Amino acid sequence: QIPSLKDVFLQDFKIGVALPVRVFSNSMDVELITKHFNSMTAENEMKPESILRRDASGKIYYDFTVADRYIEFAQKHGMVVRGHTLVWHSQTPEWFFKDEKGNLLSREAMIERMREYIHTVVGRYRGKVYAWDVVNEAVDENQPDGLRRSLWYQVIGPDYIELAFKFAHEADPDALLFYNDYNEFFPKKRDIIFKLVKEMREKGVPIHGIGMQQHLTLADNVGWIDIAIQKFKTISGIQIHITELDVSVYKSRSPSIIYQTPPSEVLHEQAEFYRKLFEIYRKHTDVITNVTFWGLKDDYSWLRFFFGRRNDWPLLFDENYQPKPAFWSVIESVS
Numbered sequence: 001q002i003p004s005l006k007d008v009f010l011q012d013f014k015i016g017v018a019l020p021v022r023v024f025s026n027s028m029d030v031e032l033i034t035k036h037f038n039s040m041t042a043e044n045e046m047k048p049e050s051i052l053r054r055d056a057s058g059k060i061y062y063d064f065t066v067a068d069r070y071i072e073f074a075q076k077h078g079m080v081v082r083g084h085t086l087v088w089h090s091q092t093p094e095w096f097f098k099d100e101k102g103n104l105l106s107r108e109a110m111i112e113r114m115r116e117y118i119h120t121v122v123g124r125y126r127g128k129v130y131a132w133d134v135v136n137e138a139v140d141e142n143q144p145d146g147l148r149r150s151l152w153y154q155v156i157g158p159d160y161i162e163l164a165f166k167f168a169h170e171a172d173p174d175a176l177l178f179y180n181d182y183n184e185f186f187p188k189k190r191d192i193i194f195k196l197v198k199e200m201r202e203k204g205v206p207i208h209g210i211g212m213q214q215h216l217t218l219a220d221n222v223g224w225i226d227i228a229i230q231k232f233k234t235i236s237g238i239q240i241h242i243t244e245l246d247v248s249v250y251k252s253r254s255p256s257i258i259y260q261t262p263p264s265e266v267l268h269e270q271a272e273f274y275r276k277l278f279e280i281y282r283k284h285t286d287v288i289t290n291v292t293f294w295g296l297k298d299d300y301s302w303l304r305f306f307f308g309r310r311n312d313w314p315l316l317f318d319e320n321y322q323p324k325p326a327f328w329s330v331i332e333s334v335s
């Protein structure tokens, strides 16, 4: 009786959701997923720490038993999959950068290890995962060259980013390859992301897309997001995915006032925020091809623990699978 998000936006972009693997054996989760979403991301199950293993010898092997379940589900229900993520400073074990004795690998050895990782993961899902977050969160505006000093930078160096895109494009030449980041609409970080992606495109690096995470709060200025998308879309042939959208009911990451249940006026403010947001996304439908929400429903949200244990209601569906005020205001950005 209520309308399907994917159908309402069928002319505009894919509507996606980030999922932990347990949802596939919960009939009520499966009902909400298949009604509303034609795209899915693994919330954690395709990150390097979720696939990388060592045996007793210290030899590296890959466990795809959980990741394969996402492709199986997607094929059964006619959904596309965003692969998240190949190269990241986070959720990657420290031993991946080291030999049997805990010394840093040589640049040559780590380039080889990166190549094998990307060829194995992207190669296994060739033709089945239409888009990859190849590199995640490489930008740090506090550094002279604007690049985070992770183990990737320390062990390989600043070309680790373009090498990751090269290897992913070799493993699946048909995949759309994304650079993904957060605070992507803050002016200093936005300008560094623009410059990184534009320069890589100009020297023929196979990057096809910017992933804008859109981890937002009610304090955020949607005007800044409009401006960021205007800047990014001036890069010839780039498309944009909104990769991890959520809207915290809080106005910072450490609120002094925490809600047990959300005030009506706070759900209404969130509904108006999501309305303005989807107006800006539709305005940029020429460049935006996928909008993915970081969680199926409010009680599954990472925002209930990652910044401290608290209730938050950041999504379009509540704890009882029911549409929120924001659901209706998002639908009405079209209807």
Ligand SMILES: CC(C)S[C@@H]1O[C@H](CO)[C@H](O)[C@H](O)[C@H]1O
Residues within 6 Å of the ligand: 090, 137, 182, 183, 213, 215, 244, 294
């Ligand atoms: C899907 C999430 C884990 S991405 C998330 O972005 C955040 C920004 O608020 C953090 O800085 C973390 O680096 C990252 O885990």
